[PDB]
Design a protein around this ligand. Structure first.
Ligand code: NI
Ligand code: NI
Ligand code: NI
Length: 89
């Protein structure tokens, strides 16, 4: 279901992309979440949260903290106490 590319996690339905999140390393220690979007047809299903979660597990492994620039990503960070020890500003 959730696939990985260079600076991205995405999901494809026939192979059409119905969700993505795009993140960018700066320095050796930071990453930015620039963009997350999910097709409007999936809107109920928590897919955005799940995509943010993947970027977080990845950045935890690679010892990078995350600046959640995308408003949606930023929203997730504000709710999730678990992401406090991985946030930077
Ligand atoms: Ni799935
Ligand atoms: Ni895109
Ligand atoms: Ni809400």
């Amino acid at each position: 279901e959730i696939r990985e590319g260079h600076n991205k996690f995405y999901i494809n339905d026939q192979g059409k992309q119905i969700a993505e999140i795009v993140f960018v390393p700066t320095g050796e220690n930071l990453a930015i979440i620039e963009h997350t979007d999910v097709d409007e047809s999936l809107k109920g299903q928590g897919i955005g949260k799940q995509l943010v979660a993947k970027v977080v597990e990845k950045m935890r492994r690679e010892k990078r903290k995350i600046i959640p620039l995308c408003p949606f990503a930023k929203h997730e960070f504000d709710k999730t106490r678990e992401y406090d020890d991985i946030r930077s500003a």
